[PDB]
Symmetry: C2
Subunit: 580 residues, 2 copies
C-alpha cells in the first residue's frame, strides 16, 4: 500500500553507491531476460542454418553455424549468470536497507519513554523488529528475484510471439500463464489444510508414544502393553491417512501444472505446424515457439508461497512501521538550557501530585527541599511510593501537577540530556548485561580507560573479588555467565556510578539486599564516596536503621512529607530494630 512506497522509495535510495547498486541490479535484471529470450532464437538460427542442401552447399560447422552455436551457449550461460549476479547484488542492497531500517527503529525505541516500555512484553519489541525486517527483506527479495523478472519475461515473450507469429500465440501464452497462476495459487492454498492436518496427526502419535513411555511403570503394573501398542498403532494409522492426502494433493499440484504447460506447448505446436505447412514459418520457428514458452515455465517455483507469505510479510512491516510512529511523551522544552551544574545542586519539590493510573495517585501535593551539597534520606513504609522519587526527578515521568526544581529552575525546561547527565542512580535491582565484568563497570562512562575502570572498582571495593574470579575482570558475567551475589552486583552498580561521576546521586533501595552486614559495608563505602566531594546524595531505603546517620531525614506517610529530623527523634516511630 502506502507502506510499499514508504519502504521502496525511501530506503534503497539514499546515497550514490547504493543507488548505483540498485541500478546495476535492475540492469542485470533486464539484461538477463534479454539474453534469456535470445537462447531460443539462436537455437532456431542453428536449425535454420543447417537445414540446407547439405550435400550441395554447406561445408563445415564454424562456417555454417559456428557463430550461432557459440552464441546459443553464451546466451544460455549469460542468462543465468545475470540472474545470479542480480540476486547477489540486490541481496546486498536489501540487506543495507534493512540494516538502516532496523537500526533507526531500535534507536527510536530507545528514545521512547519508560511508560511505553513498561507496557510491552520483554521480547515483544524485538520480535516486532525482527519479523518486520524479515518482512521487508522477503518483500524486496520476492519483487526483484521472482515477481518482476517473471512479469518482464512474460511481457518479452508475448511481445516476441506477437511480433513474429501472431496475436494468437501471445493469447495462448498469456492464457497459459493466467491458468497456471490461478491453478497454483488456488490449489496450494488447499494443500495447506492437508499439511496442517498431517502435522497435527504426527504430533498426536508422538505424544501417545511419549506419554506411554513416561508412565512406563504404570503400563506394566496394570499389564496394559497391548493396549498402548494398539493406541500408538491407531495414532500412527491416523497419521498415515493424512500423509496420504498431503502426498496425493502434491501429485495433483505438480501434474496439473505440467498439464497446463503441456497443453500450451502442444496447442502452439499445432499452430506452428499449421503455419509451417503454409510456408509462413520454418521448422526452426517451432523450436523458437517451444523454447520461449518452456523457458517461461522455469522460474515459476516461487508461486506456491507468494500469496500467503507476502500477505504475512506486509503485516509484519505494518507493525514495524507503526512502531516508528509511537510518540515520545516527555518532550524536551524548545530552547532548553543546559544549566545549574556549578550552582549548588538543591532539589525543590513544590505541590507535586503524581500517580500511575492518574485517578489513583501516589504523591499528593508533595513538597520538599534537598539542600545543596548535603546528604538526605527519605523514609517510609515499603510501598508508600517513595520508589517514584527517582522516576519523577530523573524525568522518566512527568508531574501531573506541581513542579520539580533543580537550583530554582524547572527540570521541564532544562535540556533532557543535560538533566539525565546530572543524576546518577544506584537502582534497587542491578541489571546485568551479558558481557564482561569489565564492561559492566565501563558502562557508567563508556569512554573511560581500563585504569579508570580498575580505580572505580577499587573505590567501591570490588577489585579483589574480580581478581579472585578465574579470568579476572574479563570474567564473563550475566544470566549466562558467572553468577554473582546481590552484594557484588550492588558494588558493581556503585562502581558504575563512581565512574560516571555525576553531581547528583540517588541510591534507591540499595538496602533491598538480604544481608545486614553486606549492606553495612555498602552503606559505609557509599558514604566515603559521598563525603567531601559535595555529592548531593538522596538515599531511598525502607530501613532507617541503615541510614539513621544522614545529615537530613525526610519522612513520607502516603504522598505527603510529615516531619524532618535526626536519628533519635525519628526512631520514635514504629519499625524499630528491636526485632532485628
Amino acid at each position: 500500500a502506502i507502506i510499499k512506497q514508504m519502504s521502496r522509495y525511501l530506503w534503497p535510495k539514499d546515497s550514490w553507491s547504493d543507488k548505483a547498486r540498485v541500478l546495476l541490479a535492475l540492469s542485470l535484471l533486464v539484461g538477463g531476460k534479454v539474453l534469456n529470450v535470445h537462447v531460443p532464437f539462436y537455437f532456431r538460427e542453428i536449425i535454420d542454418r543447417l537445414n540446407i542442401d547439405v550435400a550441395a552447399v554447406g561445408g563445415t560447422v564454424s562456417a555454417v553455424a559456428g557463430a550461432v552455436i557459440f552464441a546459443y551457449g553464451a546466451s544460455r550461460i549469460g542468462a543465468v549468470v545475470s540472474q545470479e549476479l542480480r540476486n547477489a547484488v540486490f541481496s546486498s542492497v536489501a540487506q543495507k536497507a534493512i540494516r538502516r531500517v532496523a537500526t533507526q527503529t531500535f534507536g527510536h525505541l530507545l528514545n521512547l519513554d519508560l511508560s511505553f516500555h513498561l507496557s510491552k512484553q520483554t521480547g515483544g519489541l524485538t520480535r516486532a523488529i525482527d519479523r518486520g525486517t524479515k518482512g521487508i527483506s522477503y518483500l524486496l527479495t520476492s519483487m526483484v528475484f521472482h515477481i518482476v523478472p517473471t512479469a518482464l519475461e512474460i511481457g518479452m515473450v508475448c511481445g516476441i510471439l506477437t511480433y513474429q507469429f501472431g496475436w494468437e500465440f501471445a493469447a495462448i501464452t498469456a492464457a497459459t500463464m493466467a491458468a497456471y497462476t490461478a491453478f497454483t495459487i488456488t490449489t496450494t492454498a488447499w494443500r495447506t489444510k492437508f499439511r496442517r492436518q498431517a502435522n497435527a496427526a504426527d504430533n498426536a502419535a508422538s505424544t501417545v508414544a511419549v506419554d506411554s513411555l513416561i508412565n512406563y511403570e504404570a503400563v506394566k503394573y496394570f499389564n496394559n502393553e497391548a493396549y498402548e501398542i494398539a493406541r500408538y498403532d491407531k495414532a500412527l494409522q491416523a497419521y498415515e491417512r493424512s500423509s496420504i492426502k498431503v502426498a496425493t494433493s502434491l501429485a495433483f499440484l505438480n501434474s496439473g501444472q505440467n498439464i497446463i504447460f503441456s497443453s500450451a506447448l502442444t496447442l502452439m505446436m499445432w499452430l506452428g505446424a499449421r503455419g509451417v505447412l503454409a510456408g509462413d514459418l520454418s521448422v526452426g520457428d517451432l523450436v523458437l515457439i517451444n523454447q520461449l514458452v518452456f523457458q517461461l515455465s522455469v522460474p515459476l517455483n516461487f508461486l506456491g508461497s507468494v500469496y500467503r507469505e507476502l500477505r504475512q510479510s506486509l503485516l509484519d512491516m505494518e507493525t514495524l512501521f507503526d512502531l516508528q510512529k509511537v510518540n515520545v511523551t516527555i518532550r524536551e522544552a524548545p530552547n532548553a538550557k543546559p544549566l545549574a551544574l556549578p550552582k549548588g545542586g538543591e532539589i525543590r519539590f513544590e505541590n507535586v501530585t503524581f500517580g500511575y493510573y492518574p485517578d489513583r495517585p501516589i504523591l499528593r501535593n508533595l513538597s520538599l527541599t534537598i539542600p545543596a551539597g548535603k546528604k538526605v534520606a527519605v523514609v517510609g513504609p515499603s510501598g508508600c511510593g517513595k520508589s517514584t522519587l527517582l522516576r519523577l526527578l530523573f524525568r522518566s515521568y512527568d508531574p501531573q501537577q506541581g513542579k520539580i526544581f533543580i537550583d530554582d529552575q524547572d527540570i521541564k525546561s532544562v535540556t533532557l540530556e543535560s538533566l539525565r547527565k546530572s543524576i546518577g542512580v544506584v537502582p534497587q535491582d542491578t541489571p546485568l548485561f551479558n558481557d564482561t565484568v569489565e564492561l559492566n563497570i565501563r558502562y557508567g562512562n563508556v569512554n573511560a580507560t581500563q585504569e579508570q575502570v580498575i580505580a572505580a572498582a577499587q573505590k567501591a571495593h570490588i577489585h579483589e573479588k574480580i581478581i579472585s574470579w578465574p579470568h579476572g575482570y574479563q570474567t564473563r558475567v550475566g544470566e549466562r555467565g558467572l553468577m554473582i551475589s546481590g552484594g557484588e552486583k550492588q558494588r558493581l552498580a556503585v562502581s558504575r556510578l563512581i565512574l560516571k561521576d555525576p553531581p547528583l546521586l540517588f541510591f534507591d533501595q540499595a538496602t533491598s539486599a538480604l544481608d545486614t552486614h553486606t549492606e553495612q559495608a555498602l552503606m559505609a563505602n557509599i558514604n566515603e564516596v559521598v563525603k567531601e566531594k559535595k555529592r548531593t546524595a538522596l538515599f531511598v531505603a525502607h530501613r532507617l536503621r541503615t541510614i539513621y546517620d544522614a545529615d537530613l531525614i525526610i519522612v513520607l506517610k502516603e504522598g505527603v512529607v510529615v516531619e524532618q529530623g535526626s536519628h533519635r527523634e525519628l526512631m520514635e516511630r514504629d519499625g524499630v530494630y528491636a526485632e532485628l
Copy 2:
C-alpha cells in the same frame, strides 16, 4: 550397509497388497522415464515430418504430423503424471513400512526391563523412534523419488545417444552428469559454512537488541542510547557481511551448474551440427540431442542435501535398529506355569540379597513370610530400602541371591504375565495419562464397562468429586488438564486397583501425601476394600502410626527383618507420634 538391506528387504515386502503397491510404483518409475525420453523423440519426429517440400507435398497438419504432435503432448503429460503417481504410491508404501517399524520398536521398548528404562532420558527413547523413522522415510523417499529415477534416466539417455549418434555423445553426457554432481556436492558442502556463519551473526544482532531493550532503564540512566544504537548497528553490519557471502556463494552454485549444462549442450550441438553437415543426422536430431540432455538437467534439484542428509539419516536408522537389539534381562522361564492363584497367596522371601549397583546392596539375606489372606505392613526408616519390596516381588528386578516364593513356587518359574496379573500396586506417586479421569479409572482393566468404572470410583469414594468437576468423569485431567490434589490422585490409583481386582495387593508409600486427615480417609477406604475378600495386602509406609492396626507388622532395619508384632510392642521404638 547391512542396515539398508535390513530395512529394504524386510519392511516393504510383507503382504500381497503392499508388494503389489511396490511393483506398481516401480513400474510407474520405469514407465515415466520411458515416456520422458519419448518427449524429445516425438519432437524430432514433428520437425522431421514438416521439414519437407511444403509447397509440393504436404497438405494439412493432422495428416502430416498430427499423430506425433499429439504424441508429443501425451508423452509430456504422461511423463509427469507417472512421476507424481509413483511418488504418491510409494509415499503410501513407505508410510506403511515406517508404521510397522515404529509400532514394533515401541512394543519392544515396552517389553524392555525397568533397569533399561531408568537409565534413559524421558524424551530420549521417543526422539530416537521419531528420528529413526524420519531416517527410514527420507532414505526410501530419496531412493525412489530422486536417486533411482535420475540414474535410470541417465542410463536411458546415454543408451539412446550411443545407439543413434555415437559413443561420444554418451561420453559427453556422462561427463556432464559427473561434473555437475561433483560440482554441486562439493560447493554445497562449502556453502553451509557460510550459511551457519550468517545464521550465527543474525542471532548475535538479535541478542544485542534483546539485551539492550530488557535493560532499558539502565540504558537511559547512564545516557547510553547512542552506544547501544552503535552496538546494534555494528552487529547488523557483521550480519550483512555474512549474508553477502551466503548470497554470493549461491550465485556461484547456480551459475556454475548452468555453466556445466550449457557447455554440454553447446558442445553436443557442435557435434550434432558436424554430423548434420555430413548427412548422418537431420536437423530434428539436433532437437533430440538437445532435449534429451536438457531433460536430464531437470530432476537434479535434490543433489544439494543428499550427501549430508542421507548420511544423517543412516545414523538415525542405526540408533533405531540398535534399540531393536537391546536384550530383556528378566527372562520368562521356559515351560512356565500360570499357577498358585486359587492357593492361599502367601509370600516367602528366603535369604534374599538384592542391590542396585550390585557391590552395594540394599537387602541383605532378607527372609520373611506373608501369611495367606491376611494384612501385613512392613515398617522402617525412610530410605531403608523397603521401596524395593515392590520391584523384587513384581519381578521388575531379579534377586541376585535368595529366592522369592508365592505359594511355595518360585516366581522365576511362574509365567511373567501370570505373575504380573496377580499383583496390583498402589504406587507412591500416581502417574497421570493426559486423558480423561474416566480413562485413568479404566486403565486398571481396559475392558471394563462404564458402570464398572463408576462402581470403582464409588468403592474408593471419588464419584462425588468427579461429579463436582465441570464436564463430569469426562474431565480432561493430567499435566495439561484440570489439576487434582495428591489425595484425589491416590483415590484414583485405588480405584484403578479395585477395577483390576487382583489377588495380591501392594500399597507402597500411599502415605507419602502430606495431609494426615486425607491419608486417614485413604487408609480407611483401602481397609474396607481389603476386608472380607481375602485380599493379601502388603502396606509399605514410613509412618507406622498410619498402619499400627495391621494383622502383622514386619520391621526392617537395613536389609534384615528384626522383629514382628502388634502396635504397642513395636511402638516402643523411635519415630513416635508424640511430635505429631
